[PDB]
Design a protein around this ligand. Structure first.
Ligand SMILES: Cn1ncc(Cl)c1C(=O)N1CCCCC1
Ligand SMILES: [Zn+2]
Ligand SMILES: [Zn+2]
Ligand SMILES: [Zn+2]
Ligand SMILES: [Zn+2]
Lengths: 69, 70
């Protein structure tokens, strides 16, 4: 039905929100500290000296173990 | 259709996985450091001395801003 198409789009968008905002290919699993923005995979997070959301300096990257992983 | 029911179930399960493992009511937005388990809301994370998943000592809690926050 048309509702099947609507639900497929909602699921696709929720899954895309869990993917790295830089490479778009790997799951988010890293937090920039101290700002807390959690928007990258470990490979993209390792290559950024400043947060891509707020431009704060990255003091270090904390790996996150999420239940959605 | 039955396909619509299957997709509704998938969506519901993904949304439930984003909720705090202790209160089951608020979104996860806190990480236990240094272990990295990110399974609680701020209130529930605040008084735990050890991680509820791996038992490691909680040195501090890091707030996390996730793109899925609704
Ligand atoms: C230009 N740049 N500087 C740091 C990072 Cl990260 C990037 C970046 O956009 N990419 C593309 C996707 C894969 C990782 C590298
Ligand atoms: Zn990436
Ligand atoms: Zn930031
Ligand atoms: Zn809670
Ligand atoms: Zn832990």
């Amino acid at each position: 039905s048309q509702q099947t198409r609507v639900l497929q789009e909602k699921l696709r968008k929720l899954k895309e929100a869990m993917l790295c905002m830089v490479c778009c290919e790997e799951e988010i699993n890293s937090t920039f500290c101290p700002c807390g923005h959690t928007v990258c995979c470990e490979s993209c997070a390792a290559q950024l000296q400043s947060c891509p959301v707020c431009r704060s300096r990255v003091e270090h990257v904390q790996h996150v173990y999420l239940p959605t992983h």
